[PDB]
Each structure stands twice: as structure tokens, then as C-alpha cells.
Coordinates of C-alpha atoms and ligand atoms in Angstrom, one line a residue:
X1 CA 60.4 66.2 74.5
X2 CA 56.6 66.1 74.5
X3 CA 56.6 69.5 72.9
X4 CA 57.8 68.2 69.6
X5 CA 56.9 63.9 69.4
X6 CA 53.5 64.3 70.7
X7 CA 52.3 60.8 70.4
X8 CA 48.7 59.9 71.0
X9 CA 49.2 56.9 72.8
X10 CA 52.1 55.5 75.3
X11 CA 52.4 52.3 72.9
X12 CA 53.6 54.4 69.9
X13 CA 56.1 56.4 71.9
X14 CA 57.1 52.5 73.6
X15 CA 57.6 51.8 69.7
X16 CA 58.4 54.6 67.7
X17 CA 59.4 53.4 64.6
X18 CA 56.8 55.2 62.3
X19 CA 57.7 58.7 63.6
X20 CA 61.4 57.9 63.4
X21 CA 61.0 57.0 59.9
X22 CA 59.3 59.7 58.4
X23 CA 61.4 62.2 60.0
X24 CA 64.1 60.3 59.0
X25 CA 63.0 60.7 54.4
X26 CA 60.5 63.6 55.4
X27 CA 62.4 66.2 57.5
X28 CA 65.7 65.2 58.8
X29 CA 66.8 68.2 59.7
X30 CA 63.7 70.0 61.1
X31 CA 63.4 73.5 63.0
X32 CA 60.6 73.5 65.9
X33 CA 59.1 77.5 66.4
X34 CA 57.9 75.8 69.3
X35 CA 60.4 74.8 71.6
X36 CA 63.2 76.9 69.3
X37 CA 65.4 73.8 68.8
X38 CA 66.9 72.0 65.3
X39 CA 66.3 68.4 65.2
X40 CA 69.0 66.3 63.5
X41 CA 67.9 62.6 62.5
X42 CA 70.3 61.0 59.8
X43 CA 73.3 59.0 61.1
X44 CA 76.2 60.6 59.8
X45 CA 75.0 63.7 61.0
X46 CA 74.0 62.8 64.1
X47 CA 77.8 61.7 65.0
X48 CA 78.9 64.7 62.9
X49 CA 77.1 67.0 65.4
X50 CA 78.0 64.3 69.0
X51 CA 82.1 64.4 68.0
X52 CA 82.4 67.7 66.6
X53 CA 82.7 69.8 69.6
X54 CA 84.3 72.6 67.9
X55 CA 81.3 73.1 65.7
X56 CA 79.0 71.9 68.3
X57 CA 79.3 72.4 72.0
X58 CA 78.1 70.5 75.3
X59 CA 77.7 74.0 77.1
X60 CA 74.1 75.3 77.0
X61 CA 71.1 76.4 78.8
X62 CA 73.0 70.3 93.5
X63 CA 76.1 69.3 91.7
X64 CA 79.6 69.6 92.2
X65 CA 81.1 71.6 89.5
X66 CA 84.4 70.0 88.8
X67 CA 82.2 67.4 87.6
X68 CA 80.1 68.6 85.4
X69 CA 81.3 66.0 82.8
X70 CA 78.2 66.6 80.4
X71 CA 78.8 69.8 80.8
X72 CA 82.2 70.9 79.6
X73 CA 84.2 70.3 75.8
X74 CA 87.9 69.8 75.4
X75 CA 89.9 70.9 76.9
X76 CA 88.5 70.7 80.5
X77 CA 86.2 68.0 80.0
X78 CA 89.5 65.2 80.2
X79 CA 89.8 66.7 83.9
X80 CA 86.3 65.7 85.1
X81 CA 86.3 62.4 83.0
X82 CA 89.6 61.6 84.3
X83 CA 88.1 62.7 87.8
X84 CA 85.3 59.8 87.3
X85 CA 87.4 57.3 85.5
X86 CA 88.8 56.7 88.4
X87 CA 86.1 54.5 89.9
X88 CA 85.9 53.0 86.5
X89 CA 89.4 51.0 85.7
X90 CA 89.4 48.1 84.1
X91 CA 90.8 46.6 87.3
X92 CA 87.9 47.6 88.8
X93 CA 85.4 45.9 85.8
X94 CA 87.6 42.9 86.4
X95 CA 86.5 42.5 90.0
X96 CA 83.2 43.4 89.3
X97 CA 82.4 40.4 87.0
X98 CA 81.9 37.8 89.6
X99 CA 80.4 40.3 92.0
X100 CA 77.7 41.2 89.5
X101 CA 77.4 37.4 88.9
X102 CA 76.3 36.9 92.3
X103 CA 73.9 39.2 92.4
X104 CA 72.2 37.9 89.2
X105 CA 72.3 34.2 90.2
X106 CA 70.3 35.4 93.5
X107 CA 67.5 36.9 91.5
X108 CA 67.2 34.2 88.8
X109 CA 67.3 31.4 91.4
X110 CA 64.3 33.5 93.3
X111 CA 62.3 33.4 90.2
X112 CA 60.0 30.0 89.9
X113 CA 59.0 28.3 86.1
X114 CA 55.6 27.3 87.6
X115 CA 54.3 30.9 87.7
X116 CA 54.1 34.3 85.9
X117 CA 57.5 36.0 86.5
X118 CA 57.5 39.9 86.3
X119 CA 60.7 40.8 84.8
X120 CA 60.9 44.5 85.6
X121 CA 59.9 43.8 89.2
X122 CA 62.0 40.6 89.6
X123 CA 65.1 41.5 87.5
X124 CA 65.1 44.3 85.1
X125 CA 64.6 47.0 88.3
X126 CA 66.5 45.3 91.0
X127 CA 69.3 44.2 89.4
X128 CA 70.9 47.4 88.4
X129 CA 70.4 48.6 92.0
X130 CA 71.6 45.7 93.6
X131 CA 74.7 45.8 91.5
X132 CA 75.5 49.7 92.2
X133 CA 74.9 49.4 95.9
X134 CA 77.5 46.6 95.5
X135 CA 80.1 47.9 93.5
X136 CA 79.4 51.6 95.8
X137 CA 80.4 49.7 99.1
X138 CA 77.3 49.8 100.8
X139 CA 77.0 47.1 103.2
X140 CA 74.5 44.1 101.7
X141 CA 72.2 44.6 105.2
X142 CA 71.5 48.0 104.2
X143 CA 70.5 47.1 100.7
X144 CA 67.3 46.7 100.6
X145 CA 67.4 50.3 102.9
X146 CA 69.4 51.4 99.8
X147 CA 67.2 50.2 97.1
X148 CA 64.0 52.1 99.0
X149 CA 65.6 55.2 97.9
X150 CA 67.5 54.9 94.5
X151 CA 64.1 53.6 93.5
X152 CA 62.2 56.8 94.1
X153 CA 65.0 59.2 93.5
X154 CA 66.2 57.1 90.1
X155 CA 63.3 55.2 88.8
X156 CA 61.2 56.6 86.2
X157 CA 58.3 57.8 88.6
X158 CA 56.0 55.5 89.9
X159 CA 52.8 54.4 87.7
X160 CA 49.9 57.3 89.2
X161 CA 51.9 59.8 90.9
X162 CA 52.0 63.5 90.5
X163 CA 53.9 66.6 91.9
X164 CA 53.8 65.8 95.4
X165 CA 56.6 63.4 93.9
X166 CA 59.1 66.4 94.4
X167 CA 58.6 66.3 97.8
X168 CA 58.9 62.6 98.0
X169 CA 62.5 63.1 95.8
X170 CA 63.9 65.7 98.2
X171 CA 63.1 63.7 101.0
X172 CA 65.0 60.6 99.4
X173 CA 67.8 63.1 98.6
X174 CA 68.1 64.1 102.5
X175 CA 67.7 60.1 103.6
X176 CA 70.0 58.8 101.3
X177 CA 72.9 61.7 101.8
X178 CA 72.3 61.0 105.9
X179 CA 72.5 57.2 105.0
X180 CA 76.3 57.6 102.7
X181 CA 78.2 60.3 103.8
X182 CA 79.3 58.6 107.0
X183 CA 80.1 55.2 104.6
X184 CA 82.6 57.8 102.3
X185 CA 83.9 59.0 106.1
X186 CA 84.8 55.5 107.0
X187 CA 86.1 54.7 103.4
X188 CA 88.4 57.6 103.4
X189 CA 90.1 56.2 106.7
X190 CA 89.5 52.3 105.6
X191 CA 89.3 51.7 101.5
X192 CA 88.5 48.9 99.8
X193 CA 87.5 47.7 96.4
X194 CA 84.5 50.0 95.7
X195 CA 83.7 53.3 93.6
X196 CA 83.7 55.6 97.0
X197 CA 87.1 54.6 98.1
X198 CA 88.2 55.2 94.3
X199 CA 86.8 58.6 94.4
X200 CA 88.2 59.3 97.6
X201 CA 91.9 58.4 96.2
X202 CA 91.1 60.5 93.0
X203 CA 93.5 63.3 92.3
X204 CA 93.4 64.8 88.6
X205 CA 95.1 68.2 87.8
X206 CA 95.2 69.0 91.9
X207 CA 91.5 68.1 92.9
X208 CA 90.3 65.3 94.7
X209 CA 87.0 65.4 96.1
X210 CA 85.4 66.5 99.6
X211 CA 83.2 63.6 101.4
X212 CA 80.1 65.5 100.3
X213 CA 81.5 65.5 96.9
X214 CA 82.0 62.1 96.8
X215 CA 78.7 61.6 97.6
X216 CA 76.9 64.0 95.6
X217 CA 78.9 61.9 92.7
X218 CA 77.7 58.9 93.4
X219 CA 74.3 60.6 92.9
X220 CA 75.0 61.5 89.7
X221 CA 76.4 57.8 88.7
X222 CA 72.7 56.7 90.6
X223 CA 71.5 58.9 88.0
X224 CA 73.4 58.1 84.9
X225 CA 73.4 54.0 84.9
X226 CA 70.0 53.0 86.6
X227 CA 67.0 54.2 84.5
X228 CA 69.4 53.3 81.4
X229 CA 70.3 50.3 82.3
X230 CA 66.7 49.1 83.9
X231 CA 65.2 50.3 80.2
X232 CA 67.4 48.1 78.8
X233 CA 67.2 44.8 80.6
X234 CA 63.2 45.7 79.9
X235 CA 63.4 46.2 76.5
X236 CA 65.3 43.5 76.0
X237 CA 63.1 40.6 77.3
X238 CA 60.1 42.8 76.0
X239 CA 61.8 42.3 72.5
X240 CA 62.5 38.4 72.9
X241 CA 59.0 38.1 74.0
X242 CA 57.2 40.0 70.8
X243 CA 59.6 41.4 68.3
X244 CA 60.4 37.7 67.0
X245 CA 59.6 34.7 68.2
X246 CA 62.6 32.6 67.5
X247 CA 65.6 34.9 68.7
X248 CA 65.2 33.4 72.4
X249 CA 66.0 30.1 71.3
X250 CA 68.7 30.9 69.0
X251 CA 70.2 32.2 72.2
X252 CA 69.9 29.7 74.6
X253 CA 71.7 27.5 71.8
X254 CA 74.0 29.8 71.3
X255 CA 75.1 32.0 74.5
X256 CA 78.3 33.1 72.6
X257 CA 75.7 35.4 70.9
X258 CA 74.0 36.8 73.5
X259 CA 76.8 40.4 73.1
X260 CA 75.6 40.4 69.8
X261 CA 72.2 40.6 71.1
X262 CA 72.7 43.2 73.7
X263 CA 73.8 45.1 70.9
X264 CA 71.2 44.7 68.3
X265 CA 68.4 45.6 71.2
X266 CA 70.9 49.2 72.1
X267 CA 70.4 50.0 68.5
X268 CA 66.9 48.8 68.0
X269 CA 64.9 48.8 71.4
X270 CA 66.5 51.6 73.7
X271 CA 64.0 54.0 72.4
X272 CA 63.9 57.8 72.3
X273 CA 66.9 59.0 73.6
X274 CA 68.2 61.8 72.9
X275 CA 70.6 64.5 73.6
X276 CA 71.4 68.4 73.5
X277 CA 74.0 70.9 72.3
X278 CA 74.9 74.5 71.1
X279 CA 75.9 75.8 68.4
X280 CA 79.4 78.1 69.0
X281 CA 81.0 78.8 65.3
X282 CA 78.7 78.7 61.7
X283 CA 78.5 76.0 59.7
X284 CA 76.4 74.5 57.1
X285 CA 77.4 71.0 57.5
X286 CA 74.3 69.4 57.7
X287 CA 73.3 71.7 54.9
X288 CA 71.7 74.7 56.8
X289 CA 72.7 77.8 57.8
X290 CA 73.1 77.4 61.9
X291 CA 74.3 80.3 63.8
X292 CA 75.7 80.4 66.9
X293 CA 73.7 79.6 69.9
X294 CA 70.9 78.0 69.0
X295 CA 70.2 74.6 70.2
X296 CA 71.0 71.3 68.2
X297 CA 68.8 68.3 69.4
X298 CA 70.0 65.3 67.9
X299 CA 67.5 61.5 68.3
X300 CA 69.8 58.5 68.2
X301 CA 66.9 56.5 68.5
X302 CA 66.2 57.4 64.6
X303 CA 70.1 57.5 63.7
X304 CA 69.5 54.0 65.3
X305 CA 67.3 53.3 62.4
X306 CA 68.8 55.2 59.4
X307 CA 68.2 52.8 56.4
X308 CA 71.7 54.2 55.0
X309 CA 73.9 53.1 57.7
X310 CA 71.7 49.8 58.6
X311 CA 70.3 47.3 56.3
X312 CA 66.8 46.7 57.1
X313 CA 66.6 49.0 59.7
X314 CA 63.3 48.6 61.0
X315 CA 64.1 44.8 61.7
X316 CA 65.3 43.3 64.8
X317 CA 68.4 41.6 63.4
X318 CA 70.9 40.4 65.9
X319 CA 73.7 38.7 62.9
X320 CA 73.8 42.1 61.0
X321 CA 77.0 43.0 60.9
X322 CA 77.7 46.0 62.2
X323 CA 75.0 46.9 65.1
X324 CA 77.6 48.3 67.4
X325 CA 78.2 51.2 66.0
X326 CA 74.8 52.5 66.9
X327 CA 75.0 55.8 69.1
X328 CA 72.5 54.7 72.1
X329 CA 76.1 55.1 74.0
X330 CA 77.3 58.2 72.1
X331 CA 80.3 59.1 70.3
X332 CA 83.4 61.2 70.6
X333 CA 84.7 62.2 73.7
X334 CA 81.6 62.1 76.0
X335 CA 80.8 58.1 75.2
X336 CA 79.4 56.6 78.2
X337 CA 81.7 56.4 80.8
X338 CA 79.1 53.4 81.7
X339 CA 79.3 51.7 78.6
X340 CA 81.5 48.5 79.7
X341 CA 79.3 47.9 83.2
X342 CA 76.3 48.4 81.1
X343 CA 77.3 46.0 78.8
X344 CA 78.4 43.8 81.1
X345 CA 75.3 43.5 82.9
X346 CA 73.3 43.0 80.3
X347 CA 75.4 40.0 79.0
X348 CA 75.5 38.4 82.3
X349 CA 71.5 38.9 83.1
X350 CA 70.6 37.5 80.2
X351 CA 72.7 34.6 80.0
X352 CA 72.3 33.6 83.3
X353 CA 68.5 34.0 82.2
X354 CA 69.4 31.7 79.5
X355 CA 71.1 29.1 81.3
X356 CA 67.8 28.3 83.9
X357 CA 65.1 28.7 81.0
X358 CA 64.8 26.9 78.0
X359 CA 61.6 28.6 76.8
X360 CA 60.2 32.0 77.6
X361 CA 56.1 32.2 77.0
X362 CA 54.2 35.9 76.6
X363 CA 51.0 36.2 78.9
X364 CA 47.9 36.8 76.6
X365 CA 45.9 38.8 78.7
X366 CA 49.1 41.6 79.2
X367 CA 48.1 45.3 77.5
X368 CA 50.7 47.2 76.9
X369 CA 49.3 50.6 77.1
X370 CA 48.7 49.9 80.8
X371 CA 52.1 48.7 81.8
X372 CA 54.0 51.9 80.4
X373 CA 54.7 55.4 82.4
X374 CA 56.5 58.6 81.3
X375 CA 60.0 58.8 81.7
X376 CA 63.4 60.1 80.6
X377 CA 63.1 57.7 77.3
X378 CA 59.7 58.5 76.8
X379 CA 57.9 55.6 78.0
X380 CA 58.9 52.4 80.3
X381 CA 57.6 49.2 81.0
X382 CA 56.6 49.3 84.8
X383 CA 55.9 45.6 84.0
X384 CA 56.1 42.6 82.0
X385 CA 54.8 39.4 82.9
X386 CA 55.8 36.0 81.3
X387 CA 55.7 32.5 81.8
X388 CA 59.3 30.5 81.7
X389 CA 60.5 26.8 81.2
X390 CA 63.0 25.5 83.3
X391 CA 66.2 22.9 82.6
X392 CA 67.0 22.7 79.0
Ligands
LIG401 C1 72.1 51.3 78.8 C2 72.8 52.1 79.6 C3 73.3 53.4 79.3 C4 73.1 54.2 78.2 C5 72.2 53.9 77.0 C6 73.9 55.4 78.4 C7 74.0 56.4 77.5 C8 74.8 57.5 77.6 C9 74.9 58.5 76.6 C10 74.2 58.6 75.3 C11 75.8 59.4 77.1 C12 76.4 60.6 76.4 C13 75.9 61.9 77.0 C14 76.3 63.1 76.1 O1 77.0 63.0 75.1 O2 75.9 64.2 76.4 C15 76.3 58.9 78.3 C16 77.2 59.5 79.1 C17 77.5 59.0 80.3 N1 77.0 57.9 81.0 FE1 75.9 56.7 80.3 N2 74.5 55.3 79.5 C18 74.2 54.1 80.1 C19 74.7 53.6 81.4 C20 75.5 54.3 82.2 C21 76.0 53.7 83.4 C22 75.6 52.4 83.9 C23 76.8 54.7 83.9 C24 77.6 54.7 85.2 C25 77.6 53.7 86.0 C26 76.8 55.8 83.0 C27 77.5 56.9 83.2 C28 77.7 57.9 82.1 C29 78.5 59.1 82.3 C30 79.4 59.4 83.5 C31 78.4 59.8 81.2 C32 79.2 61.1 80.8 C33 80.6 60.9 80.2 C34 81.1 62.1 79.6 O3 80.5 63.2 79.4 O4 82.3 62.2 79.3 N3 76.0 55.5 82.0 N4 75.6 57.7 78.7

């Protein structure tokens, strides 16, 4: 990443609007000697180069193998989707609902209107974690045990920290695998409603999964659905607090539109992501010569903003019509798996949000540029203070 952006300060990566649109008239399609990588910007090619598989391919450059879902096209990819879509039916989504509710009525209920609230501390981090240890079947004494470890293994760093971080991971990585595998043991003789009894009944083209599978999968779900979805809930009260003024109210009169809203802040606010893949049969197509090989690199975040598929691109518009079909989630076969828990609780955080505090009040002494640390993304609030009015 760095090796291409560079961005002299954390707040311009935070909000990278300026970048994205100068590459997006200036040099949409851009080689980079440097790192030996295209760079695809524009929207229709962007999903031109995420769906087309055939023309551009997810293979490229521990974890179990049979699910390698990133890492694998059609035909074999529907094995180790199907392998993982198991723990994500919509049976499943329908219990989780008032589960996840729960969890975010705790949280808001521990949060008082008479001081400073930090929402990445208090909600944004916590309630992704709380959720997935739920929905894992990991017993709600051990929570906080569990949380002590997803945080350091899945959370973008800490604030100061350094390469002695490694160590810190891998020790994670042995507590927490000592920690689950006897939970998947007891789940495999005693199952209930949760994603490691799922996984344990999963059986897709003849392979199910070994305990230590299971658990090493669960790792990669860790990994997949809690920095997103932290960035996210961030993002989102980062935008209601400065981006416009007037959208948190509209809200809390209207709840109905608080999808809408989720939406407009995937397409507007999740920023850089990004995503890889290689090239396996010539094409122009995006009107250069690629060969075969050589690695496509292709920035939602700016497809996000691409004036041609969305009216006033560069403004945080949550009634314009057709936000959702931003690719922050993807598109073609490898859309997030995620996508409906995601969704789901983002919608339920913020309107539960919604439903305790009328109005919502940005601290004046907060600097951003302290407050962000590298990540996945690019940058990421490690907090975000603000001051809240109860009732309506
Ligand atoms: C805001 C939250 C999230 C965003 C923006 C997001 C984004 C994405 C994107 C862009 C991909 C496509 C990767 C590619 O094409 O190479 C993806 C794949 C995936 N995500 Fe998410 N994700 C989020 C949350 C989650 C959550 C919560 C989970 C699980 C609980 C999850 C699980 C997955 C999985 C398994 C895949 C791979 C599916 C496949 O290759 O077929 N994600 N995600």
C-alpha cells in the first residue's frame, strides 16, 4: 500500500478524497515500476476486473487449504464457499438478530449522556467482538478472556507499538487455539446454535473439517469481519459527527432510513480498501495491453467515488438512489460471505444508538491526526469522543 499512496499525513489517508479523484480523471489505469502492479480506479472497470475471473484470477503471489476461499476461482472456489456457508444460513442470521440485539442494548445502556462517550472504545470495537464470540459459542464468562485476544490478534495494532507486536500476535495465536479447540471438542459431541457446531456438521464434496480446522476457520472469520466491521461502525459515527451536521437527526426521525445510511457510509466512508489479482489470459479491456501474470490492483474506495456511476460523488448523500451497488463488499462470486451480519450490525448499532440519543455533539478539543493508527484500510480511528443527549 504505502509504496504507491504515500500520504503525508494520517488525516489525508483517513480522508482520501483528493487522491482518489485525481487518479480517478488523471491516471485511471496507472502502472507502478515500483511495486510492479496496475492500478484500476474507474467503476465499470473495477467490477469488470472483481467478476471476470476468467480474464482475471484470485490466484497470486497457518491456514487450512480447503479453505482458501480468497484464494481459488470457479470451479473450486463453490467448494470452499459452500464449506463456510455453512455457518452462514439464513436460519442462522434469523437467530442471530435478537442475539446481536442483546449485545448492543448492553453497550448503549453502559454509555451515560452526562459525559464524553468514546465510541470506538465503548461500541465501535467491542461490539463486533462481543457479537462473534456470541454467535461462535463461546461461553459469555469467558468473553471478556475472549475479547483480550481477538483484540490483539484482529485489531488494527495498538496506537505506539512496533515489531515486538509479532511476538505478542503469536502468543495470542497459542492462547486463543488452547482456549477453543476444547469448545469445538465439546461441540462436536453436544451442538447447538453457533458457527463451530455448523462447521463441525459441514460436509461439501466429501470434506468436513478436523477440530483444528474448525478452529483455525474461525480465525480466519476473526480475521475477515472484525477490523471491517469495527472501521465501519467508526466511520460511521465519525461521518454523522463531521461530514454533515443534519444527517443524525434526519435519522433519529426517520429509523426506516438508517439501511440507507449504512449504505451511503460503505460507499463513502469505508476508505482505502482494496484488493488483488492476476492476470491468466490477454486482454485489453480496460484498454491496455496486460499479459499474463502480472498483478491487477484494483481501489474500490475510488470506484466508490467515480463521478460516472455516482452523482456527486464526493458528497455524503444518504437518499441518492443507487448507493448499494458500491463495491466496498465486492462483486461476482467472492462478495462477502459477511455481507448480511455486517449489515446487520450496523443497522442494529446505530439504531439502537438512535433510539437512546436525540442529539449527538463533537468535542472541540479532538485532533484527528492523533486519534488515527496504520492499518489494513490505511488509517483507523483508535478513538472518537463525543458528547450525547438522552430521551427524545
Ligand atoms: C464492513 C465489513 C466488511 C467488508 C467491507 C468486507 C469486505 C469484503 C470484501 C471486499 C471481500 C472480497 C474479497 C475478494 O474479492 O478477494 C470480502 C470477502 C469476504 N468476507 Fe468480508 N467484509 C466485511 C465483513 C465480513 C464479515 C463480518 C465476515 C464474516 C463474519 C466476512 C467474511 C468474508 C469472507 C469469508 C470473504 C470471502 C468470500 C469468498 O471469497 O468467496 N466479511 N469481504
Amino acid at each position: 500500500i504505502k509504496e504507491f499512496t504515500r500520504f503525508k499525513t494520517r488525516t489525508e489517508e483517513f480522508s482520501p478524497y483528493a487522491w482518489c479523484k485525481r487518479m480517478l480523471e488523471n491516471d485511471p489505469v496507472s502502472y507502478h515500476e515500483g511495486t510492479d502492479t496496475w492500478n484500476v480506479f474507474k467503476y465499470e472497470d473495477v467490477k469488470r476486473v472483481l467478476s471476470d475471473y476468467k480474464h482475471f484470477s484470485s490466484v497470486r503471489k497457518s491456514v487450512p487449504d480447503k479453505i482458501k476461499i480468497t484464494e481459488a476461482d470457479p470451479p473450486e472456489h463453490r467448494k470452499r464457499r459452500s464449506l463456510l456457508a455453512a455457518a452462514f444460513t439464513p436460519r442462522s442470521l434469523q437467530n442471530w438478530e435478537p442475539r446481536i440485539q442483546e449485545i448492543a442494548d448492553e453497550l448503549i445502556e453502559e454509555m451515560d449522556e452526562e459525559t464524553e462517550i468514546d465510541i470506538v472504545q465503548s461500541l465501535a470495537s467491542p461490539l463486533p467482538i462481543i457479537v462473534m464470540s456470541d454467535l461462535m459459542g463461546v461461553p459469555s464468562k469467558d468473553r471478556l478472556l475472549f475479547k483480550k485476544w481477538v483484540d490483539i490478534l484482529f485489531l488494527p495494532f495498538d496506537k505506539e507499538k512496533q515489531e515486538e507486536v509479532n511476538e505478542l500476535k503469536q502468543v495470542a495465536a497459542k492462547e486463543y487455539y488452547q482456549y477453543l479447540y476444547p469448545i469445538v471438542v465439546q461441540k462436536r459431541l453436544n451442538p447447538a446454535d453457533d458457527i463451530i457446531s455448523d462447521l463441525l456438521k459441514a460436509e461439501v464434496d466429501g470434506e468436513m473439517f478436523t477440530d483444528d480446522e474448525v478452529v483455525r476457520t474461525t480465525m480466519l472469520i476473526l480475521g475477515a469481519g472484525v477490523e471491517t466491521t469495527s472501521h465501519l461502525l467508526a466511520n460511521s459515527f465519525y461521518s454523522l459527527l463531521y461530514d454533515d451536521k443534519e444527517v443524525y437527526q434526519e435519522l433519529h426521525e426517520n429509523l426506516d432510513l438508517v439501511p440507507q445510511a449504512v449504505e451511503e457510509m460503505l460507499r463513502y466512508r469505508f476508505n482505502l480498501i482494496k484488493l488483488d489479482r492476476t492476470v491468466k489470459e490477454d486482454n485489453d479491456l480496460l484498454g491496455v495491453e496486460l499479459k499474463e501474470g502480472e498483478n491487477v490492483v484494483v481501489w474500490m474506495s475510488a470506484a466508490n467515488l467515480d463521478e460516472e456511476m455516482f452523482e456527486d460523488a464526493f458528497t455524503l448523500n444518504i437518499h441518492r438512489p443507487n448507493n448499494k451497488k458500491h463495491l466496498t463488499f465486492g462483486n461476482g462470486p467472492h462478495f462477502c460471505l459477511g455481507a448480511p451480519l455486517a449489515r446487520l450490525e450496523a443497522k442494529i448499532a446505530l439504531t439502537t444508538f438512535l433510539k437512546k440519543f436525540k442529539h449527538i455533539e463533537a468535542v472541540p478539543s479532538f485532533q484527528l491526526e492523533d486519534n488515527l493508527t496504520d492499518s489494513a484500510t490505511g488509517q483507523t480511528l483508535t478513538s472518537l469522543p463525543l458528547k450525547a443527549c438522552r430521551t427524545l
